[PDB]
Amino acid sequence: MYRVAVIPGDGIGPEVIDGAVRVLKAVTGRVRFEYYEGGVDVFQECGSPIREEDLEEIRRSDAVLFGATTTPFDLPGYRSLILTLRKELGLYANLRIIPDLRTGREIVIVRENSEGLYFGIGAVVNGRAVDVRLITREGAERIARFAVEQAKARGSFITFVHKANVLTGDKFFRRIVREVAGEEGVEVRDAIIDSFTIKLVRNPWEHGVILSENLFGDILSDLATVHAGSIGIVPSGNYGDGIALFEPVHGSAPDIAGKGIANPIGAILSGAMLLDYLGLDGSLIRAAVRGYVVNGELTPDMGGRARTEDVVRGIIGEIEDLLSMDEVW
Amino acid sequence: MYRVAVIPGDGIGPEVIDGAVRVLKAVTGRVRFEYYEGGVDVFQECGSPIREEDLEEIRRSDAVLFGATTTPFDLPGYRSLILTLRKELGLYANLRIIPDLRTGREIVIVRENSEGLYFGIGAVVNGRAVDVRLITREGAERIARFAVEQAKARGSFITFVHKANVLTGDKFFRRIVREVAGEEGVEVRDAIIDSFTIKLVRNPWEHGVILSENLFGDILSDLATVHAGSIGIVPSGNYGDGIALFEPVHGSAPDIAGKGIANPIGAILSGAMLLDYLGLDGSLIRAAVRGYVVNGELTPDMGGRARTEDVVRGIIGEIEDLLSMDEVW
Ligand SMILES: O=C(O)CC[C@H](C(=O)O)[C@@H](O)C(=O)O
Ligand SMILES: O=C(O)CC[C@H](C(=O)O)[C@@H](O)C(=O)O
Ligand SMILES: [Mn+2]
Ligand SMILES: [Mn+2]
């Protein structure tokens, strides 16, 4: 079997992960799911958002499936569950796919996931505060390789977004991205972070594999979600060398917790990316979602009157259909 | 008289500045304009993009009016004309107003203009590249004061955009922004840089005075231009303690240089901000622009068949009308 660690978190996390897990269970019985707590509650007890013993099991697992965690600004000493898991598990590539569910068109973003302004070197001293945007040869080389694999697989190109005129680290990063994409026969268009925002809202589908430094990726990937029903359908994967973690790009939405109306699509499509990573069949889930969405009642965030459970049940419906065929004939 | 230094630059710079200067001359005869070269041509000769002698006159001038300069990525040692002028003249506040010309609704952005990732400390050493995002008490205090004056004058509030969870310097910056806006009775809503991008494209007009660190401001202010005809109509001012500089937010658009079809509105509205700064009457220019735009033929970037000259002539038309009245009756 495959061992998958599951961290539902809080807010709508549990609800959408219930949805995703149930969809996964409907496409394969080859995955054992083990659940773990994490977040503020665990921080309160042990001073970390994930227990050391739980963290050890998690890294021995084959993949991780993650919901959403509330990160409060007013909790001294708290570090993000997801940032913690990203660093602890070596998760250097963050892939976000923003889908137009009708057409199957995709905005594909590769966000470097381990350095940049997230590296963690920061200080206040004598009324001067500082943060160090770090780019390393190792960080840039592997995030570039990863982006070229995505471009190769899609018979596509890379759009490297930066601000090289102002940032030494982006001049560096750009040169390395160009080296490795040369070696591998991939085109690299470049784009400046400010003007690209305009291009991203106006001409969404013409950018291939978008690549960028961590914080720029964080910004651009939220921005790209405007081209989808709601941020509620957008999935992602965080990849490292021996393990990966999958989470919807939405967050806790505590406002709507427990009201039975959260959108499980993003988590479901994330369980899809998880199956791909394991060598199982995520294309099934994707087809199920496309198909349910033609005439299915959608959740309120997408302008519909449907409940979470209705959407889950409906997608499982489409799966059972595709599944009961022999490759589709 | 007022002495105004004018730096048309290259590309469409000269064309739109010709437009702006002609509009200024139609509302006041109290401004003497002196022209100066700057950019790559001057860099080629003297190794700086502005001559030291020219720079000295410029700082003795009352204000500066600036077009657009091409900053090529492949010119070793070249620093931006505008970045150079920003640092040399002490221009710490950058105000960008994105207007909906029909309604007179405005997205108002205050971009800190002297530090952050623009401070200039960067290095490559041993396959590690670095840039230092610097926030100082002095930088944050004065950019906050400036933002509160804009909120006070509009009977409005501040939206401070940041990524405090990840950036020490934003935790600092946020506390100082909150201090000074408390002292002055201004509300401070806050927003996270990633999720705010969604809010900015979806709910543009409900954010009051948006305030942020330099690079974040650079990004957000380009993004905000999607809510306007084209980036072509958007103006700005760069303010310091003894002088200010005004430029359209668009750039060189060399693609369309010399073709007689550039949009002079952004420069014109920037000449408006310049008149306000001098205590002259920029509201005139703004009314002229609103009025011309009701039925006037617009330039191709706004979906029309008009030439630069037509729009300039038309706005001067509206000015002459408003001007020939006694405060409007
Ligand atoms: O809880 C946090 O501060 C992390 C949020 C996290 C990030 O990458 O910054 C989230 O914004 C995301 O895009 O994954
Ligand atoms: O020529 C340059 O690199 C400066 C461009 C300048 C900036 O603030 O980065 C421009 O993008 C702007 O928004 O003013
Ligand atoms: Mn984010
Ligand atoms: Mn810019």
Helix/strand order of chain A, N-terminal first: EHEHHEHEEEEHEHEHEHEEHHH
- Output the CATH topology of chain A: Isopropylmalate Dehydrogenase
With helices defined by DSSP (H or I, 4 residues minimum), what is the helix count of chain A?
Answer: 11
Biggest interface and residues each: A-B, 47 and 47 residues
Pfam family, one (chains A, B): Iso_dh
Protein name (chains A, B): Homoisocitrate dehydrogenase
GO molecular function, one term (chains A, B): 3-isopropylmalate dehydrogenase activity
Cofactor (chains A, B): Mg(2+)
Produce the secondary structure layout:
2 copies of one chain form a homodimer.
Chain A: E1 2-9, H1 13-27, E2 31-35, H2 40-46, H3 52-60, E3 63-68, H4 81-88, E4 93-99, E5 106-112, E6 122-124, E7 128-136, H5 137-153, E8 158-162, H6 168-183, E9 188-192, H7 193-202, E10 209-212, H8 214-224, E11 236-239, E12 244-246, H9 265-278, H10 283-295, H11 308-323
Parallel strand pairs in A: 1-2, 1-3, 3-12, 5-10, 8-9, 8-10
Antiparallel strand pairs in A: 4-5, 4-11, 6-7, 11-12
Helix pairs in contact in A: 1-9, 1-11, 5-6, 7-8, 9-10, 10-11
The structure holds (1R,2S)-1-hydroxybutane-1,2,4-tricarboxylic acid (2 copies) and manganese (II) ion (2 copies).
Binding site for Mn(2+) (chains A, B): 194, 218, 222
GO molecular function (chains A, B): 3-isopropylmalate dehydrogenase activity; isocitrate dehydrogenase (NAD+) activity; magnesium ion binding; NAD binding
Domain Isopropylmalate dehydrogenase-like (chains A, B): 3-315
